[PDB]
């Protein structure tokens, strides 16, 4: 589990939107820019920008 540090609006069909403070669960790093995860609040799963989220 990670927590968003900023709001983000998805920019492609494989991305998910979230808000500052959102818990992100079952996070898997993909590369240095992107991770997979589920936005707990909305229940949506997809790609998130890694630089918007912080571990724990």
């Amino acid at each position: 589990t990670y927590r968003a540090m900023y709001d983000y609006s998805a920019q492609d069909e494989d991305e998910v939107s979230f808000r500052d403070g959102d818990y992100i669960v079952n996070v898997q790093p993909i590369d240095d820019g992107w991770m997979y995860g589920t936005v707990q609040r909305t229940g949506r799963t997809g790609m998130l920008p890694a630089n918007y989220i912080e571990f724990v």
Binding site: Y6, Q11, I30, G33, W34, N51, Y52
Partner: peptide, 11 residues
Amino acid sequence: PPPTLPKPKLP
């Protein structure tokens, strides 16, 4: 918020 980096088409 900061810029995002290029996406990867996986894998």
